[PDB]
Amino acid sequence: AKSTENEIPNLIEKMVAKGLNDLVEQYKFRETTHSKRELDSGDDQPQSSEAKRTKFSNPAIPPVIDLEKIK
Amino acid sequence: YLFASDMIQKFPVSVHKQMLRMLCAKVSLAARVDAGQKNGDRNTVLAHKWKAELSKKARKLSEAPSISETKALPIPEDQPKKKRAGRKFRKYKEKFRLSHVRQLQNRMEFGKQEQTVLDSYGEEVGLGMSNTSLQQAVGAT
Amino acid sequence: APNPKAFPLADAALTQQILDVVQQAANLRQLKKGANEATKTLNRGISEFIIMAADCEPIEILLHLPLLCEDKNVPYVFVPSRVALGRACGVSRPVIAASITTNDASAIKTQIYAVKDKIETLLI
Amino acid sequence: ASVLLPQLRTGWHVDQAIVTETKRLVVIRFGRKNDRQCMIMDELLSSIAERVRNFAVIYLCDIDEVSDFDEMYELTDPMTVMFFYHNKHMMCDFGTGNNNKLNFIVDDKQEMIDILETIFRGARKNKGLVVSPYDYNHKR
Amino acid sequence: LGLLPKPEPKVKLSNMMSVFENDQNITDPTAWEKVVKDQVDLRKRKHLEENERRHEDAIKRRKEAVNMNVEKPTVYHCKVFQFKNLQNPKIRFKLKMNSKELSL
RNA sequence: UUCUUGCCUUUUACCAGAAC
RNA sequence: AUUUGGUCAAUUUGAAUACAGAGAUCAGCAGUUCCCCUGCAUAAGGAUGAACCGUU
RNA sequence: AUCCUUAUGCACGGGAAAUACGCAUAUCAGUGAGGAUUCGUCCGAGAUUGUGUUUUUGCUGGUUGAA
């Protein structure tokens, strides 16, 4: 919960980003379960690269951020 | 035997197949439960629930969809935007193009009596100017 | 917490292994989801081992399968989660029973055998 | 239908209706509530209206009540409909020889829809007139 | 809205004859062929290059990864075999190297 | 107005007969 | 025996101008889905090879 | 370290189809959807409803005309 509080906006988009990250870490079976995402975050931790890919995923999973930037 | 049950045969014939299927599985489940139970337990709550569920299912099947809000005709604008082609795309569109032989057929020679074909279903058919004059005079193609 | 009559419940790692096997089995068309299919498999003799769900409620719809297995001498487990089992099988819906079936010429034969052995060990 | 199609109350309302639909076309049935032909027309238009909601709006009008618009037909007063777009009255040449209004029931729903579409198209172009795809001549 | 790249038509040796966006298609016929064939090669090469890159990166990861993974073993499977003789070198070697491989 | 003829295809207006 | 089914729209009007009403045609490529092959990765799971002795 | 099986992810390449492919705060679904049958039994995963496009989406090139 603490972890979620600090870095994680804990919406659907964030979850998606997290999922993507684990796939890029090198997943096969759907990464891991998420009770409140904390577990997932913990699992990711071994990879040790969280904050970059969510700032990338919003540019892709919609293009709204990109549009904003343009404007 | 099951199909002749009250549980199926009360509902409309629309539902009977699905209803019957439902019954089979639920019946099986009930049987299993019975097998599991020791003598002098007579729980029979699960069965009740199943029955209720079955009833609900039946009701749902009998009830139809609520009326559709009549889908509107699109604001008639007459756009010719597309403009495409591609070995890919031109195939599909080939299926909907009139092909060259059909075009030829659609052409009718002016003075001449045009080549028909006597389909036994209907003689009407105009083979048109798809057959070359000389060719037509001689035979087929 | 899981039902007492759901026995033998597989240990975490073991459960995971079983799930993996099932997934492999699903891929290979070696697996048969569901009570009724599982039952059929048992009748046939094709079943290698039967994987059940502890969180099947009402549990007693399940509890014939174990008996059948016992009478057929087929290893059987429960895993804890029906949902998980379903996922493994390749079904978003809750599956409660499954059968990994026999097929000598499978790639995953060895895996299946291992799981069977594990299941047997569990039983007593 | 009475319940389905909105009916208008007084000439002002009618005028407003005619003006306000910038995007859509406006079909005003002018007709005496209890008449056969008028009723038939209303029934037809009910069907059409839902279909063509996206391009044309239908409204009804009791012509004996709202006497403001006996400019529109020179005091002949059969059971009519009228067509409008951007407050400009829309002329539709049928066989009838009254190009201004269709003063005759058409039985085909689809046909009616088609004619509505045609007039909408004409309006969009700006063409005050439009030639209908159906000849009529017989109904009148 | 970005215009960061521009998408060029993916020629091949079958499209070769029908693509005219890139010029020289009959004018410089062998040149055109070279261009198209070259393009194809690049595409193929790119694919191969990508694969190579992937292979490299994976390899890089694996060494690091193994080092990282000093997990706490919960329970250990064991097997004890006994034999009457092994005056064969080969068998001994097999026993060694396999063991080394499997962290056994 | 309704039914039957004939213009025919519609408005009249008719063709030529019944019924109210 | 007569007649109705026959009004161009648009613009400028307080009848004149208009005069039928305002992109076409040929061709790429990419995407979408499914399939097949191929190389790589990821998991899993095999199968197998390699001289010779090792570690308190 | 080499070879292979499975699934998936990315891609070279080749092929077919788009009457197809989605979408849903829907309803139901391996606790059985839908089907087979030689009638003994067998297969076992979508079905329903709503709806969006669907003679096509996104991009290019040419000739042309326009004049």
Side-chain angles (χ1 to χ4, degrees), chain A residues 28-29 32-35 39-46 48-54:
Chain A
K28 174 36 49 227
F29 300 131
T32 44
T33 51
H34 33 251
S35 297
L39 294 174
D40 190 18
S41 210
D43 190 62
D44 188 23
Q45 279 173 16
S48 76
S49 48
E50 302 92 320
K52 295 182 182 179
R53 309 203 207 287
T54 191

Short mmCIF file of all heavy atoms in Angstrom, two decimals, chain A residues 26-54, unseen atoms left out:
data_model
loop_
_atom_site.label_atom_id
_atom_site.label_comp_id
_atom_site.label_asym_id
_atom_site.label_seq_id
_atom_site.Cartn_x
_atom_site.Cartn_y
_atom_site.Cartn_z
N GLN A 26 10.65 -9.94 -19.49
CA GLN A 26 10.74 -11.19 -20.27
C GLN A 26 9.75 -12.24 -19.76
O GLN A 26 10.15 -13.28 -19.24
CB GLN A 26 12.16 -11.77 -20.29
N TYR A 27 8.46 -11.96 -19.93
CA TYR A 27 7.39 -12.81 -19.39
C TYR A 27 6.91 -13.84 -20.40
O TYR A 27 7.09 -13.65 -21.61
CB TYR A 27 6.18 -11.97 -18.96
N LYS A 28 6.31 -14.91 -19.89
CA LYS A 28 5.55 -15.84 -20.71
C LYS A 28 4.12 -15.95 -20.21
O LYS A 28 3.22 -15.34 -20.79
CB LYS A 28 6.22 -17.21 -20.83
CG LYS A 28 5.40 -18.29 -21.55
CD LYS A 28 4.56 -17.81 -22.73
CE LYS A 28 5.31 -16.94 -23.73
NZ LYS A 28 4.57 -15.71 -24.13
N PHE A 29 3.89 -16.73 -19.15
CA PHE A 29 2.57 -16.79 -18.54
C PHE A 29 2.31 -15.42 -17.92
O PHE A 29 3.22 -14.85 -17.31
CB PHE A 29 2.49 -17.86 -17.45
CG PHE A 29 2.78 -19.27 -17.94
CD1 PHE A 29 3.69 -20.08 -17.26
CD2 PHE A 29 2.12 -19.79 -19.05
CE1 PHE A 29 3.95 -21.37 -17.69
CE2 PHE A 29 2.38 -21.09 -19.48
CZ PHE A 29 3.30 -21.88 -18.80
N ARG A 30 1.10 -14.89 -18.10
CA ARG A 30 0.76 -13.52 -17.67
C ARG A 30 1.47 -13.17 -16.37
O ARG A 30 1.09 -13.66 -15.30
CB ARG A 30 -0.75 -13.36 -17.49
N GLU A 31 2.53 -12.36 -16.50
CA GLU A 31 3.45 -12.00 -15.41
C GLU A 31 3.13 -12.60 -14.03
O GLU A 31 3.66 -13.66 -13.67
CB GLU A 31 3.57 -10.47 -15.32
N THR A 32 2.24 -11.92 -13.30
CA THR A 32 1.87 -12.26 -11.92
C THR A 32 0.51 -11.65 -11.56
O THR A 32 0.05 -10.70 -12.21
CB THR A 32 2.92 -11.74 -10.91
OG1 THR A 32 3.30 -10.40 -11.26
CG2 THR A 32 4.16 -12.62 -10.89
N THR A 33 -0.13 -12.18 -10.53
CA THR A 33 -1.40 -11.64 -10.04
C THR A 33 -1.17 -10.32 -9.30
O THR A 33 -0.05 -10.00 -8.90
CB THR A 33 -2.10 -12.63 -9.09
OG1 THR A 33 -1.19 -13.06 -8.07
CG2 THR A 33 -2.60 -13.84 -9.86
N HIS A 34 -2.26 -9.57 -9.12
CA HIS A 34 -2.23 -8.30 -8.37
C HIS A 34 -3.42 -8.22 -7.41
O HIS A 34 -4.56 -8.03 -7.84
CB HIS A 34 -2.18 -7.08 -9.31
CG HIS A 34 -2.91 -7.26 -10.62
ND1 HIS A 34 -2.24 -7.39 -11.82
CD2 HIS A 34 -4.23 -7.32 -10.91
CE1 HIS A 34 -3.13 -7.53 -12.79
NE2 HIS A 34 -4.34 -7.49 -12.26
N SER A 35 -3.15 -8.37 -6.12
CA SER A 35 -4.17 -8.21 -5.08
C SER A 35 -4.55 -6.74 -4.96
O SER A 35 -5.73 -6.39 -5.02
CB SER A 35 -3.67 -8.74 -3.73
OG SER A 35 -3.41 -10.13 -3.79
N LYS A 36 -3.54 -5.89 -4.78
CA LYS A 36 -3.67 -4.44 -4.94
C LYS A 36 -2.49 -3.84 -5.71
O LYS A 36 -2.15 -2.67 -5.53
CB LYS A 36 -3.79 -3.77 -3.56
N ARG A 37 -1.85 -4.67 -6.55
CA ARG A 37 -0.69 -4.29 -7.38
C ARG A 37 0.65 -4.32 -6.64
O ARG A 37 1.70 -4.35 -7.30
CB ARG A 37 -0.88 -2.91 -8.04
N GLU A 38 0.59 -4.28 -5.30
CA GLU A 38 1.76 -4.26 -4.47
C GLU A 38 2.64 -5.48 -4.74
O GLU A 38 3.87 -5.37 -4.90
CB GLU A 38 1.37 -4.23 -2.99
N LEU A 39 1.97 -6.63 -4.79
CA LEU A 39 2.63 -7.92 -5.03
C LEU A 39 3.37 -7.88 -6.37
O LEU A 39 4.53 -8.30 -6.47
CB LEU A 39 1.62 -9.07 -5.02
CG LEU A 39 0.93 -9.39 -3.69
CD1 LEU A 39 -0.13 -10.46 -3.89
CD2 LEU A 39 1.93 -9.81 -2.63
N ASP A 40 2.65 -7.37 -7.37
CA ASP A 40 3.18 -7.25 -8.74
C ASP A 40 4.45 -6.40 -8.74
O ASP A 40 5.46 -6.77 -9.35
CB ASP A 40 2.14 -6.67 -9.70
CG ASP A 40 2.56 -6.75 -11.17
OD1 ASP A 40 3.48 -7.53 -11.52
OD2 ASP A 40 1.96 -6.03 -12.00
N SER A 41 4.35 -5.28 -8.03
CA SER A 41 5.46 -4.33 -7.91
C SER A 41 6.68 -5.02 -7.31
O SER A 41 7.81 -4.87 -7.80
CB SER A 41 5.08 -3.04 -7.16
OG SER A 41 5.84 -1.94 -7.64
N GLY A 42 6.42 -5.76 -6.24
CA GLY A 42 7.45 -6.51 -5.52
C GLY A 42 8.16 -7.48 -6.46
O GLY A 42 9.39 -7.56 -6.48
N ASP A 43 7.34 -8.19 -7.23
CA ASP A 43 7.82 -9.18 -8.20
C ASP A 43 8.75 -8.51 -9.21
O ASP A 43 9.83 -9.02 -9.52
CB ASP A 43 6.67 -9.90 -8.93
CG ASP A 43 7.17 -11.09 -9.74
OD1 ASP A 43 7.72 -12.03 -9.15
OD2 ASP A 43 7.00 -11.07 -10.98
N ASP A 44 8.29 -7.37 -9.70
CA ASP A 44 9.03 -6.57 -10.68
C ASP A 44 10.40 -6.18 -10.12
O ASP A 44 11.40 -6.31 -10.82
CB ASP A 44 8.25 -5.32 -11.10
CG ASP A 44 8.91 -4.57 -12.25
OD1 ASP A 44 9.70 -5.18 -13.02
OD2 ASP A 44 8.64 -3.36 -12.39
N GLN A 45 10.38 -5.73 -8.88
CA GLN A 45 11.57 -5.29 -8.17
C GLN A 45 12.92 -5.90 -8.53
O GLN A 45 13.82 -5.14 -8.76
CB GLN A 45 11.39 -5.26 -6.63
CG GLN A 45 10.67 -4.03 -6.09
CD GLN A 45 10.35 -4.11 -4.60
OE1 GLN A 45 10.90 -4.94 -3.88
NE2 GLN A 45 9.45 -3.24 -4.14
N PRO A 46 13.05 -7.25 -8.58
CA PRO A 46 14.21 -7.94 -9.16
C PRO A 46 14.74 -7.39 -10.50
O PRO A 46 15.95 -7.33 -10.70
CB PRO A 46 13.69 -9.36 -9.34
CG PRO A 46 12.76 -9.55 -8.18
CD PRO A 46 12.27 -8.18 -7.75
N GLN A 47 13.83 -7.00 -11.39
CA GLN A 47 14.19 -6.30 -12.64
C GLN A 47 14.75 -4.90 -12.36
O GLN A 47 15.72 -4.48 -12.99
CB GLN A 47 12.99 -6.19 -13.57
N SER A 48 14.11 -4.19 -11.43
CA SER A 48 14.57 -2.89 -10.91
C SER A 48 14.55 -1.78 -11.97
O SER A 48 15.57 -1.16 -12.27
CB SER A 48 15.95 -3.01 -10.23
OG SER A 48 17.01 -3.12 -11.17
N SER A 49 13.36 -1.54 -12.52
CA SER A 49 13.16 -0.51 -13.55
C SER A 49 11.66 -0.24 -13.75
O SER A 49 11.04 -0.80 -14.66
CB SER A 49 13.82 -0.95 -14.87
OG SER A 49 13.47 -2.28 -15.20
N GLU A 50 11.11 0.62 -12.91
CA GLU A 50 9.65 0.83 -12.82
C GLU A 50 9.15 2.12 -13.49
O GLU A 50 8.21 2.08 -14.29
CB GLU A 50 9.22 0.86 -11.35
CG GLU A 50 9.56 -0.40 -10.56
CD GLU A 50 10.91 -0.33 -9.85
OE1 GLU A 50 11.88 0.19 -10.44
OE2 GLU A 50 10.99 -0.82 -8.70
N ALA A 51 9.79 3.24 -13.16
CA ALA A 51 9.26 4.58 -13.45
C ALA A 51 9.31 5.03 -14.91
O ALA A 51 8.51 5.87 -15.32
CB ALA A 51 9.96 5.62 -12.57
N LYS A 52 10.26 4.50 -15.68
CA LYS A 52 10.45 4.92 -17.08
C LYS A 52 9.31 4.50 -18.02
O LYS A 52 8.88 5.29 -18.86
CB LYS A 52 11.77 4.36 -17.64
CG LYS A 52 13.03 4.88 -16.96
CD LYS A 52 14.26 4.29 -17.62
CE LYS A 52 15.54 4.76 -16.94
NZ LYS A 52 16.75 4.15 -17.57
N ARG A 53 8.83 3.27 -17.86
CA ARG A 53 7.95 2.64 -18.84
C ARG A 53 6.49 3.10 -18.76
O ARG A 53 5.79 3.06 -19.76
CB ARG A 53 8.04 1.11 -18.76
CG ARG A 53 9.47 0.59 -18.79
CD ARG A 53 9.56 -0.85 -19.27
NE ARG A 53 10.74 -1.54 -18.72
CZ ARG A 53 12.00 -1.34 -19.11
NH1 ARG A 53 12.31 -0.46 -20.07
NH2 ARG A 53 12.98 -2.04 -18.53
N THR A 54 6.04 3.52 -17.57
CA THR A 54 4.72 4.16 -17.43
C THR A 54 4.67 5.56 -18.05
O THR A 54 3.62 5.98 -18.55
CB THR A 54 4.24 4.22 -15.95
OG1 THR A 54 2.86 4.61 -15.92
CG2 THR A 54 5.07 5.19 -15.12
#
